[PDB]
DNA sequence: TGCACAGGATGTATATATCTGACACGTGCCTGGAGACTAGGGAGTAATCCCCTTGGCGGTTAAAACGCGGGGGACAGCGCGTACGTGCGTTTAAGCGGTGCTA
């Protein structure tokens, strides 16, 4: 979806669609690659009212 | 007899003045600004060709890092002996201003 990622294919810099794939392998074969499951928490007040 | 003071003597901190330096005001000349001529170095313009990261990636290696033993280097104490510090008496020549020459 990244818009910035569709101008890099665009692009057809062959490196960058490279770097694309690789990146895509990674996201496909393990999550924690791209992005570390984020350990969710309760949202925090600055102060109460 | 010895004291009080009438009459007189050197002195001097106080006070009035004379003996030296520095800054501002007056002359007057080598100027600083200005006018105009000047051109070629600076700056605006245009390639152009070459060198600098791409970007992380694994498979490696050489250097970096970390761990340990220990032994000897650093270093705080201190016994003591003397050679620099403080204080004379004493001498030199360094300082002061002066007179006459000159290079």
Do not use: D, Y
């Amino acid at each position: 979806s990244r818009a910035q990622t569709k101008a890099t294919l665009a692009s057809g810099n062959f490196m960058s669609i490279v770097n694309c794939l690789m990146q895509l392998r990674k996201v496909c074969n393990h999550p924690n690659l791209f992005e570390v499951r984020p350990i969710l928490t309760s949202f925090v007040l600055e102060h109460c009212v």
